[PDB]
Design a protein around this ligand. Structure first.
Ligand SMILES: *C/C=C1/C(=C/c2[nH]c(/C=C3[NH+]=C(/C=C4\NC(=O)C(C=C)=C4C)C(C)=C\3CCC(=O)O)c(CCC(=O)O)c2C)NC(=O)[C@H]1C
Ligand SMILES: *C/C=C1/C(=C/c2[nH]c(/C=C3[NH+]=C(/C=C4\NC(=O)C(C=C)=C4C)C(C)=C\3CCC(=O)O)c(CCC(=O)O)c2C)NC(=O)[C@H]1C
Lengths: 313, 315
């Protein structure tokens, strides 16, 4: 099963109980964005991140009464149609708001049962993706495909290190390709135990295909209330990219000297084949539109891995 | 019966009839569609060899001036990028794309690929979260039918085409429309089936490697290359990989007879085989700009993946 989260007086995690940390329900988010939850029917704002006032520019109480209808007039009917009752928690809808306080915000919404989860992040506003797609497809074998993928991602993102991290049948991990800035350790060829990415992390990564820690030293921002009014239970946040990273994994990243981390799942035959894993030495908020490019690349790599593995077997 | 290609018309080959379809050499027509321009150049020196006859009007230069310069001089910023992206021996399927600001012609999209020692350069005029939203909707579709319906509707919304269909090949190469989105008033093709020869075997082979082709105006005359043969080889210039390549006159007549002014299909490729086509129709001529066509190319790949996934959920 899972332990209760901390804020419901559950045990603190150790290396004795890696597998049982309820990483999906931390009750908090990373501070480079803001999150609101809301009722599926009424559009009634039920929870907000204590930092919402910053991003939205709204007097705190104003929000926690109001309706999405009021708050987002153009958007609220689109949401209603895009995310019908009963849809999967994996389905997401995005829009760009030109919002008074903040030039442009990206809005990302998904639905978990009766709750809409809304994420707001700063945003903005060429051929590198098309060029990359063809490059991946003409790679002659899996090894070269891995090399092209890591190089392409590094060029698109500027990340200090990009790896392709492949799982063995026992969930032992191996770094089979790597693109990195001069003057970093090489992790190419190294293998790591399965407990570095615990089973409950791997399952969540099979369904929700991108996560990140923008700053491995930033404090999480609580949800208020912490419990969902609807249920008097924790809000599931695993489909939210803003979700606070496990402090065990942030300790792991800090001990490695990483300041910013991001990965994309490569899913083949319904299973987690591996990860595009990125490191930055310093804090780094990759903007939403560039993340989208990596999300596309994730799908394309999933296709090409199967194609390429089929021409060996 | 499968038989080798005839020589093209310009090398004294015969004219194509219903008798001998599968032998038209549709990859070497010696000509392009008039809404863009094409140059060929030597892959090592960058000497310009062939050009479409309309090139002066896209590129704003006399032929003899174009042909008298190397790509190093014509494309000083792109020439080194081309050479890195398209190394000798690379496959003909690999494409490099850039946007140019050309004085006379505005923003041009440049698409380049390499066939042996030849570079092929295509120039076309070029111009929010719809793709991301579509990607997730496709993935959440519960079964093959719902996927097919979401895919057709999405493509129609992105493009404005009068008719978008998902055409699926059977094992005997006969095809069947299995989903479609269509303009009000058009008659339905859903559930109809069509003989294997409607798309002959040399087309289906080419459609497994080069995943997007089009006819922007089914009445437009083709524009010859000049000279027609590659001076490197005194042989035909391979245009299988060029979206500007002239469509087969047999196929344009099949389309005009249907009342179609514009056609476009994306290949859906599963396990190395052509599974089906996203096929679109418009009643009037219609040019879809290169950046919009890129969205369809990306959806072609997504759909190939999702078709595998939906079919595996099915035994
Ligand atoms: C008690 C359990 C421990 C634990 C937990 C844990 N680990 C993750 C997630 C990740 N761990 C990763 C590990 C590596 N990154 C590398 O670069 C290398 C090798 C050079 C390794 C072995 C990775 C890539 C992830 C994915 C996330 C990311 O991209 O940063 C989680 C889940 C984090 C979250 O989503 O909140 C958890 C709980 N890690 C341990 O080392 C043990 C002690
Ligand atoms: C004597 C040979 C004939 C022939 C040749 C031919 N056909 C193609 C390619 C295509 N034919 C298509 C046929 C259909 N379009 C539809 O809408 C339907 C059903 C509603 C069918 C059956 C299609 C879709 C294509 C693909 C290209 C496209 O999307 O327009 C070629 C190759 C064309 C080229 O690449 O230049 C050739 C030579 N078709 C016949 O019917 C016989 C008479």
């Amino acid at each position: 099963p899972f332990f209760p989260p901390l804020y419901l007086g559950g045990p603190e995690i150790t290396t004795e109980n890696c597998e049982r940390e309820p990483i999906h329900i931390p009750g908090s988010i990373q501070p480079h964005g803001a999150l609101l939850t809301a009722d599926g029917h009424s559009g009634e704002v039920l929870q907000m991140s204590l930092n919402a006032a910053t991003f939205l520019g709204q007097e705190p109480t104003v929000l926690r009464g109001q309706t999405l209808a009021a708050l987002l007039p153009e958007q609220w009917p689109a949401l209603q149609a895009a995310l019908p009752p009963g849809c999967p928690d994996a389905l997401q809808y995005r829009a760009t708001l030109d919002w008074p306080a903040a030039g442009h915000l990206s809005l990302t919404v998904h639905r978990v049962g009766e709750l809409l989860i809304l994420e707001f992040e700063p945003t903005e506003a060429p051929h590198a993706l098309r060029n990359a797609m063809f490059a991946l497809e003409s790679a002659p074998n899996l090894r070269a495909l891995a090399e092209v993928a890591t190089q392409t991602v590094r060029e698109l993102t500027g990340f200090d290190r990009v790896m392709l991290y492949k799982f063995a049948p026992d969930a032992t991990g191996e770094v089979i390709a790597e693109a990195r800035r001069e003057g970093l350790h090489a992790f190419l060829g190294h293998r790591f135990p399965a407990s570095d990415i615990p089973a409950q992390a791997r399952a969540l990564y099979t369904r929700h295909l991108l996560r990140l820690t923008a700053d491995t030293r930033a404090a999480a921002v609580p949800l208020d209330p912490v419990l969902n009014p609807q249920t008097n239970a924790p809000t599931p946040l695993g489909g939210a990219v803003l979700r606070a990273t496990s402090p065990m994994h942030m300790q792991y990243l800090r001990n490695m000297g990483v300041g910013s981390s991001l990965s994309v799942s490569v899913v083949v035959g319904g299973q987690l084949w591996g990860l595009i894993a990125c490191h930055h030495q310093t804090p780094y908020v990759l903007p939403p539109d560039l993340r989208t490019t990596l999300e596309y690349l994730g799908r394309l790599l999933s296709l090409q891995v199967q194609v390429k593995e089929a021409l060996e077997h």
